[PDB]
Amino acid sequence: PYTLSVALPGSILDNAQSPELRTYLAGQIARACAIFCVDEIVVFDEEACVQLARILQYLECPQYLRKAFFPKHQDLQFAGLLNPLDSPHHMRQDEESEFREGIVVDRPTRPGHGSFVNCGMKKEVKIDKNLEPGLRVTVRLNQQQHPDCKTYHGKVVSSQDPRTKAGLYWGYTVRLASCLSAVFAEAPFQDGYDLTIGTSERGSDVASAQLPNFRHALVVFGGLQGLEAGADADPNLEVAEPSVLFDLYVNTCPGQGSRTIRTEEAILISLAALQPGLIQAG
């Protein structure tokens, strides 16, 4: 199955009128990406990124694991006033699920015995492998999980498994990039992004665009000054206009009735505008 990654600059957070709205905006990004089953979000420095990245990670992390993975931070002061992702890997105890994220507990194992994992279930989940504690893992529960002395049983599996195997969106990862050229180069896939797509009012009409067969797509968004800012700023990138950095450069809202479309708005519009092209090619 193909991947989709989204890049945008942290600087959009500097545009907010309030601390509260700065947080809400971060949430808007998370949900936009969750909605379109994004696998990866890349926060890049166009000239804050740390705050945006942190918030995105907090929201993606299932709830029963936030306490463990995120100590009190001034950068999640407004956790509260968030929109939740309501994504398949966020459930309550109650819900039976095939798979469930977990943290490798830090309790006494016994010579030979796999670790304990906290999957937010009524009891801890016992597994096969002995593992380094505080590791986030993806556990697939057994079956024949008898009313066993205060332990469920299961096996750890690839975090790719709930997509490839059961068609379940299962969260995104978050990557920090120090510039726009680091967006492309510090990619997590062997052969980079088979397909790159940039966005702008002065790009080509998205209705013309013909998506090439692809394996890993990246869609890039600018902040307030467009992608021009992050192109110029980066020393490793000497272009007249940013169109040439990407396979495609699209305008996703023809005949827009506002002089501007904000980044968080543009992401929803662009990803829908593209969603059918994406599905066809991957």
Place this chain on the structure above:
Amino acid sequence: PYTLSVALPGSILDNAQSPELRTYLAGQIARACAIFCVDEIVVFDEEACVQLARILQYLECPQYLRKAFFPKHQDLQFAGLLNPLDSPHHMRQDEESEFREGIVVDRPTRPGHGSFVNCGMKKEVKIDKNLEPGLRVTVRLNQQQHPDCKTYHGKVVSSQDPRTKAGLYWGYTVRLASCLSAVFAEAPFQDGYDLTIGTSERGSDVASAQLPNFRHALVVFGGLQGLEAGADADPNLEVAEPSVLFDLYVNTCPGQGSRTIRTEEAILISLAALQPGLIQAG
């Protein structure tokens, strides 16, 4: 040229965590509609509507006219923390424009002479017709506007003119509907909405949908409980499911990775998902 109207319930404002966010959410709606060149927004009562309607009107009104048309209200306490529409009819003095909205001043006219209008220009604009003051009008400036004794000159024209004639998006109007059946029936066009479109995760796939040639489109959105709530609530509408109220009932985001898409999010997604179908048929 075809029209596009959007309907949604005021109740989405009751979902906000803050007074501030209640206002911001209202703004999100305005911009979504501005972006897609919406002509009409219909706020309906699914079981607040007044507050949402007011905010939408405040944002659409050009700035130089807000003071005149909107006294201090507790329902625009957070005007400040808004996103602006940046639409063609919002400019500063500075900008030369062919057309410009105005209010008919309330100054001494002379037997025979047209009114004075305030179009936010350096001088008042003198016109042809004698008109009832406090009327919002659409003025088209002349040419041969000589350095005349502290008055510009121009003619009042249809508010439809800057679209039909110069391809300029020029704002939306706002209508209150007391229920869902009032959305369709209290429509401002002789022959209603030639095409109706409702939205839901349990609608048909938007990629299949084949838009009929049309003159006036309405796209309807539910609040938190979907359109089911406003269907049931209204006494004049006895249906098992809301699909049948509309010509088309679409899911605009196939394979969504969040269990829910909020109304303000769904509007951006749906309107993009449809925008190309719309353009083809009108």
